[PDB]
């Protein structure tokens, strides 16, 4: 390798790690949304009954 | 507790290194003084030739 | 340097002025680092209360 190629390899690793952190953050926010929507739906059907 | 015993353990070694560098300086200064005594002996033997 | 050549030039005054400036410089930078970490502690101390009351 050449030093520019070596440095671009390590920044590609760092950007992959940052991308995977972004995917996990979006997944956890959507987990919280699924929890609140599910709880509201079940309680509304409960009160209708 | 442990940091104090490591601190004084290292403080000792720092102290006799502090003494040894001064010892080497005061040795080599008199070595230079004897070399300065040695040079003019060569000069005062150059004259009688 | 040997006996005749320790000349005490402009360089020795320049070097002692640089050292004497430098302990003050490093001291002020450590003081500002301590101030910044104190500020970060205070912002956490209020972020906890806002997050609880929400």
């Amino acid at each position: 390798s050449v030093p520019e190629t070596w440095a671009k390899f390590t920044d590609d690793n760092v950007l992959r790690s940052q991308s995977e952190r972004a995917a996990s953050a979006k997944l956890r926010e959507e987990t919280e949304n699924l929890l609140i929507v599910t709880a509201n739906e079940m309680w509304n059907q409960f009160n209708k009954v | 507790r442990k940091v104090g015993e490591r601190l004084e353990d290292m403080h000792c070694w720092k102290s006799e290194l502090q003494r040894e560098i001064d010892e080497l300086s005061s040795e080599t200064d008199l070595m230079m003084a004897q070399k300065l005594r040695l040079q003019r002996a060569l000069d005062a033997t150059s004259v009688p030739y | 340097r040997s006996n005749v050549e320790l000349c005490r030039d402009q360089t020795q005054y320049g070097l002692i002025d640089e050292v004497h400036q430098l302990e003050a410089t490093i001291n002020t930078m450590k003081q500002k680092l301590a101030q910044t970490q104190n500020a970060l502690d205070a912002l956490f101390k209020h972020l906890a209360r806002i997050q609880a009351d929400i």
């Binding site: - | 940091v3 104090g4 490591r6 601190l7 353990d9 290292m10 403080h11 070694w13 720092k14 006799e16 290194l17 502090q18 040894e20 560098i21 010892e23 080497l24 300086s25 040795e27 080599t28 008199l30 070595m31 230079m32 004897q34 070399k35 005594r37 040695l38 040079q39 003019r40 002996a41 005062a44 033997t45 004259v47 009688p48 | 301590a34 970490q37 104190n38 970060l40 502690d41």
Partner: protein
């Protein structure tokens, strides 16, 4: 021998310098308690340290430096006590041979040999 003493002085002082660095950081390390400020989450730190040695070898390294440094210093003592002795031998031998030459003359020479360095000038005082 002057240059060798100078070199070993630099080596021992650099050892002392890294020990001064460690002593400087442990003094700030010990003054942390649970109440005071300057604390942050540094999460990898407990997991992922790497070390270089043991305190036994931490001692053994500076024993080896002091051992070599004192061997060098005593070798310099040996040579500085040889130099003065051989210089006294040179002074005595030259003054002896000059006196022998004057006895031979007795058994331009006066006007030249009337100037000569003495014992203190052969010594260099």
């Amino acid at each position: 021998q002057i240059r060798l003493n100078r070199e070993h002085k630099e080596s021992c002082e650099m050892n002392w310098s890294d020990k001064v660095e460690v002593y400087n950081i442990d003094d700030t390390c010990s003054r942390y308690t649970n109440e005071s400020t300057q604390v942050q989450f540094y999460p990898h730190s407990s997991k992922f340290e790497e070390s270089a040695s043991t305190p036994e070898t931490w001692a053994k390294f500076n024993h080896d430096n002091l051992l070599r440094a004192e061997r060098e210093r005593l070798a310099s003592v040996n040579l500085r006590k040889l130099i003065d002795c051989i210089l006294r031998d040179t002074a005595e031998d030259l003054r002896l041979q000059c006196d022998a030459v004057n006895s031979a003359f007795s058994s331009k020479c006066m006007t030249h040999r009337n100037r000569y360095p003495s014992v203190l000038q052969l010594a260099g005082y």
